[PDB]
Enzyme design. Structure first.
Site, short mmCIF file in Angstrom:
data_model
loop_
_atom_site.label_atom_id
_atom_site.label_comp_id
_atom_site.label_asym_id
_atom_site.label_seq_id
_atom_site.Cartn_x
_atom_site.Cartn_y
_atom_site.Cartn_z
N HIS A 76 -48.48 6.42 37.43
CA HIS A 76 -47.34 6.92 38.20
C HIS A 76 -46.07 6.13 37.93
CE1 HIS A 76 -48.39 3.84 41.39
NE2 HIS A 76 -47.08 3.90 41.60
N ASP A 100 -55.05 6.87 37.79
CA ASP A 100 -53.69 6.34 37.82
C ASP A 100 -53.53 5.10 36.94
OD1 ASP A 100 -51.01 6.32 38.50
OD2 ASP A 100 -51.32 5.31 40.44
N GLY A 156 -42.87 -1.53 44.29
CA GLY A 156 -42.56 -2.11 43.01
C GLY A 156 -43.61 -3.06 42.48
N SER A 158 -47.04 -2.06 42.16
CA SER A 158 -48.14 -1.38 41.49
C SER A 158 -48.24 -1.91 40.07
CB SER A 158 -47.94 0.14 41.48
OG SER A 158 -46.86 0.53 40.67
C1 LIG Z 1 -48.16 11.18 38.43
O1 LIG Z 1 -49.54 10.97 38.19
C2 LIG Z 1 -50.27 10.28 39.15
C3 LIG Z 1 -51.77 10.12 38.95
C4 LIG Z 1 -52.63 9.38 39.96
C5 LIG Z 1 -51.93 8.83 41.21
N1 LIG Z 1 -52.75 8.13 42.19
C6 LIG Z 1 -52.10 7.59 43.35
C7 LIG Z 1 -52.89 6.86 44.42
C8 LIG Z 1 -50.60 7.79 43.52
O2 LIG Z 1 -50.01 7.25 44.65
C9 LIG Z 1 -48.51 7.36 44.59
C10 LIG Z 1 -47.96 6.36 44.01
C11 LIG Z 1 -48.38 5.14 45.02
C12 LIG Z 1 -47.41 3.95 45.16
O3 LIG Z 1 -46.31 4.07 45.66
N2 LIG Z 1 -47.93 2.69 44.66
C13 LIG Z 1 -47.19 1.49 44.97
C14 LIG Z 1 -45.95 1.04 44.22
O4 LIG Z 1 -45.45 -0.04 44.34
N3 LIG Z 1 -45.42 2.01 43.32
S1 LIG Z 1 -44.05 1.55 42.51
O5 LIG Z 1 -42.99 1.32 43.49
O6 LIG Z 1 -44.18 0.34 41.70
C15 LIG Z 1 -43.59 2.99 41.53
C16 LIG Z 1 -43.35 4.32 42.29
C17 LIG Z 1 -42.66 2.62 40.37
C18 LIG Z 1 -44.12 3.02 40.09
C19 LIG Z 1 -48.02 0.27 45.39
C20 LIG Z 1 -47.08 0.98 46.38
C21 LIG Z 1 -46.14 0.10 47.18
C22 LIG Z 1 -45.62 0.55 48.33
C23 LIG Z 1 -45.96 1.91 49.00
C24 LIG Z 1 -44.71 2.80 49.12
C25 LIG Z 1 -45.05 4.12 49.85
C26 LIG Z 1 -46.03 4.97 48.99
C27 LIG Z 1 -47.44 5.00 49.68
C28 LIG Z 1 -48.48 5.71 48.83
N4 LIG Z 1 -49.72 5.67 49.56
C29 LIG Z 1 -50.39 6.91 49.93
O7 LIG Z 1 -49.94 7.96 49.61
C30 LIG Z 1 -51.68 6.76 50.74
N5 LIG Z 1 -51.53 7.62 51.90
C31 LIG Z 1 -51.06 7.03 53.15
C32 LIG Z 1 -50.88 7.92 54.40
O8 LIG Z 1 -50.82 5.87 53.20
C33 LIG Z 1 -52.93 7.11 49.93
C34 LIG Z 1 -52.99 6.25 48.64
C35 LIG Z 1 -52.91 8.61 49.53
C36 LIG Z 1 -54.18 6.78 50.78
C37 LIG Z 1 -48.56 4.94 47.50
O9 LIG Z 1 -48.74 3.78 47.48
N6 LIG Z 1 -48.38 5.67 46.23
C38 LIG Z 1 -48.15 7.19 46.10
N7 LIG Z 1 -49.77 8.47 42.57
C39 LIG Z 1 -50.45 9.01 41.40
C40 LIG Z 1 -49.58 9.74 40.39
#
Ligand SMILES: COc1ccc2nc(C)c(O[C@@H]3C[C@H]4C(=O)N[C@]5(C(=O)NS(=O)(=O)C6(C)CC6)C[C@H]5/C=C\CCCCC[C@H](NC(=O)[C@@H](NC(C)=O)C(C)(C)C)C(=O)N4C3)nc2c1
Ligand SMILES: [Zn+2]
Length: 198
Positions: A76, A100, A156, A158
């Site tokens: 992602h 992911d 930021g 992940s």
């Molecule tokens: C496009 O192809 C794909 C394929 C597979 C895939 N698999 C996934 C599991 C997936 O997740 C999406 C991305 C992931 C995310 O933001 N990660 C980081 C991060 O830092 N990112 S980042 O900023 O570096 C970036 C954006 C530059 C890169 C660690 C989190 C830090 C802070 C959280 C911010 C709020 C988001 C909360 C989300 N959490 C939920 O949705 C849960 N639900 C609730 C209610 O909590 C769950 C997980 C559903 C239980 C969440 O964390 N997300 C959504 N996207 C994908 C896409």
């Protein structure tokens, strides 16, 4: 039209999380202008060091972690993008949208974490701000924060590692589990999935 179709840029290493000494801290190795240029050319001659890199595209910034000679991060963040390297763009050697997960050959000069074999559930998450956050493992791909924090704190990070007490890699941070904007738990790609993907 076909003549004008653009190409997405490469992922670019723009810094690292320094874990070499007694104090963890973020270091920037490339600024935003040079990042933009390097993403377009795919040619990055900067020296790479360490296990946890800070990476950027034109639109996002996140982390990447070297484990067993592969620089791993999240789909992602990176999509199918190449990574910039001294000899031009390097294609992913692993891509798994279902997990992911993506990976490239680890850059020359990086150091790799070793996959954990301890079976320990007392973990540590390393963020892009070099915070080392205690996390209790709660399942194959879940852990709880001992001290919950707003999701802003984790955004930021992940692609960063969860480590065991001995500093082995246990997994790659994938997603935050939030209630009312507070991260009480994290979702991560277990190192066993990486070892299998390999
Ligand atoms: C496009 O192809 C794909 C394929 C597979 C895939 N698999 C996934 C599991 C997936 O997740 C999406 C991305 C992931 C995310 O933001 N990660 C980081 C991060 O830092 N990112 S980042 O900023 O570096 C970036 C954006 C530059 C890169 C660690 C989190 C830090 C802070 C959280 C911010 C709020 C988001 C909360 C989300 N959490 C939920 O949705 C849960 N639900 C609730 C209610 O909590 C769950 C997980 C559903 C239980 C969440 O964390 N997300 C959504 N996207 C994908 C896409
Ligand atoms: Zn271990």
């Amino acid at each position: 039209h076909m003549a004008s179709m653009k190409k997405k840029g490469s992922v670019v290493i723009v810094g690292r999380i320094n874990l070499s000494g007694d104090t963890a801290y973020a270091q920037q190795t490339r600024g935003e202008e040079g990042c933009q240029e390097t993403s377009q050319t795919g040619r990055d001659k900067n020296q790479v060091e360490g296990e946890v890199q800070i990476v950027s595209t034109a639109t996002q910034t996140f982390l990447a972690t070297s484990i067993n000679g592969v620089l791993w991060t999240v789909y992602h963040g990176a999509g199918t993008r190449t990574i910039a390297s001294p000899k031009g763009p390097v294609t992913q050697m692993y891509t798994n949208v279902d997990k992911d997960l993506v990976g490239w050959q680890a850059p020359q000069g990086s150091r790799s974490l070793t996959p954990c074999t301890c079976g320990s559930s007392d973990l540590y998450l390393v963020t892009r701000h070099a915070d080392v956050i205690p996390v209790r493992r709660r399942g194959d791909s879940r852990g709880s924060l001992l001290s919950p924090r707003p999701i802003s704190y984790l955004k930021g990070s992940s692609g960063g590692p969860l480590l065991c007490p001995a500093g082995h890699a246990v997994g790659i941070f994938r997603a935050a589990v939030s209630t009312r904007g507070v991260a009480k738990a994290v979702d991560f790609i277990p190192v066993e999935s990486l070892e299998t993907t390999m």
